[PDB]
Amino acid sequence: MVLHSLHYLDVAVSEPSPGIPQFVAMGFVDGIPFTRYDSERGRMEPLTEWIKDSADPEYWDSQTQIGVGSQHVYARSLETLRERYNQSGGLHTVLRVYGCELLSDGSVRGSERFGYDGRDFISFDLESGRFMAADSAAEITRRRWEHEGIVAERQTNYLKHECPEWLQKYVGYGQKELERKEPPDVHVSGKEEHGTLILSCHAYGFYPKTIAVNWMKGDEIWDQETEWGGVVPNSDGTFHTWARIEALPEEREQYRCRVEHPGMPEPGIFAWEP
Amino acid sequence: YMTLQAVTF
Amino acid sequence: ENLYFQSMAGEAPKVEVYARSRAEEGKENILHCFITGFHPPKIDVELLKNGEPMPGVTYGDLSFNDKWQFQRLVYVPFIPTREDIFTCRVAHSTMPEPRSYRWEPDF
Ligand SMILES: [Cl-]
Ligand SMILES: [Mg+2]
């Protein structure tokens, strides 16, 4: 089971537009954003108090250099693929997710995945240990990267050794924030329109992201008729979600919502209270 | 620790 | 080969509209618009109270999912009322017209 995760999302665009710099690299610990580089500011900077108070100057400085290097590599990568796919100019995007997970058995998973204009380009995983090309333009990259095993050795040492060592440092630094449990505030709402009552069970303000939200109809579970929203983010670092159902107005009182969360003394039960 | 620079395609 | 590749079909955004907390009249709250599923990453977003732009709009960081689809959280302080219509209006390349998503009040 995954216990902790360190990952970075890189977004590089060929054409800056409002609210999209040329390059942004963001770091997450257990999903929580904690560090950021962008081509406007030109510096790695802390997004949490805990990494600010635990980091030193050389931490920010050393990562600035890689962010600057990555920015320039992506500019070159964007021109390479445009020329390779003989594409139109204008807006193109290279995305990269990479990082590691620490499992309950003490073991490490890691990977690096790149995307181009919304599809798989090339990917790497510690399980298989070789670059996978999604199409024939990526095959050219795969061949160059596999030469003398050089890039696969750097990726492996980073994802298998450096990444989990730094994850363990950050888990310490962030222990308080990471460990906390705020339970949901649950409410059921009811729009009784078109002859057809719609019933929504909303869980507000919960951390972490794991939650069970299930509609009941008498003694039955009602998934067949249930629709769930995503588990989506609040501005304050907590989560929101909802399970919905359609009911006849007459039978509205047969239905109740069950919600379990780690911050819960016990599983809770909720109904429409007009 | 963001020290895995992108490699050019 | 002599091949000329076309960018590929855009994906139109999906929009979830939700408050931080259950609406209570006169109690300050946060209206969220979570925009997902879209390619390419350019969107225009407005948060409207009776068709008028709500003051203090904040937009979060651009991220993306396993399918490389972009997502963004846009949010603003508000006081929910029964009389007023709160909408998230979203424009994208793939969309011939901008589209409004109404906050269904959770009073
Ligand atoms: Cl990952
Ligand atoms: Mg895609």
Author numbering:
A (entry chain A): 2 to 275
B (entry chain F): 1 to 9
C (entry chain B): -2 to 104
Give the exact sentences the study uses for this entry.
Here we set out to determine the structural properties of Acar3, the most highly expressed MHC-I molecule from a long-distance migratory songbird, the great reed warbler Acrocephalus arundinaceus (Acar). MHC-I molecules are expressed on all nucleated cells and are central in adaptive immune responses towards intracellular pathogens, such as viruses and intracellular bacteria. MHC-I molecules present antigens to CD8+ T-cells, and if the antigen is pathogen-derived, the cell will be killed, whereas cells only displaying self-antigens are left untouched. Six distinct pockets (A-F), previously identified in human HLAs, are present in the Acar3 peptide-binding groove (PBG), which is created by the α1 and α2 subunits with their α-helices lining the sides, and the shared β-sheet that forms the bottom of the crevice.
From this assay, the three top-ranked peptides with respect to half-lives of Acar3 complexes, i.e. peptide 1 (AMSAQAAAF, “P1”; T½ = 11.3 h), peptide 2 (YMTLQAVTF, “P2”; T½ = 11.2 h) and peptide 3 (MTMITPPTF; “P3”; T½ = 10.3 h), were selected for further studies. High-quality crystal structures were obtained for P2 and P3 in space group P212121 at resolutions of 2.15 Å and 2.25 Å, respectively. Comparing the binding modes of peptides P2 and P3 within the Acar3 PBG, it is evident that the five residues at positions 5-9 are well aligned in both structures, whereas their conformations differ substantially among their first four amino acids. The Met anchor at position 2 of P2 is placed in pocket B of the Acar3 PBG. Simultaneously, the N-terminal Tyr1 residue is accommodated in the aromatic/hydrophobic environment created by the residues of pocket A. The N-terminus and the carbonyl oxygen of residue 1 establish hydrogen bonds with the three conserved Tyr residues (Tyr9, Tyr159, Tyr171) in pocket A. The side chain of Gln64 was found to play a prominent role in facilitating the unusual arrangement of P3 in the Acar3 PBG. While in the P2 structure Gln64 forms a hydrogen bond with the peptide-nitrogen of Met2, Gln64 creates a hydrogen bond with the carbonyl oxygen of M1 in the P3 complex. Following the conformational differences in the N-terminal segment, both peptides align starting from their residues at position 5. This convergence is facilitated through hydrogen-bonding interactions of the backbone-carbonyl oxygens of Leu4 in P2 and Ile4 in P3 with the guanidinium group of Arg97 which ascends from the bottom of the PBG. Residues Val7 (P2) and Pro7 (P3) are located in pocket E, and the backbone-nitrogen atom Val7 participates in water-bridged hydrogen bonds with Glu113/Gln156 (bottom row). In both Acar3-peptide complexes, the aromatic side chain of Phe9 is deeply buried in pocket F with the backbone-NH and the carboxy terminus oriented towards the opening of the PBG.
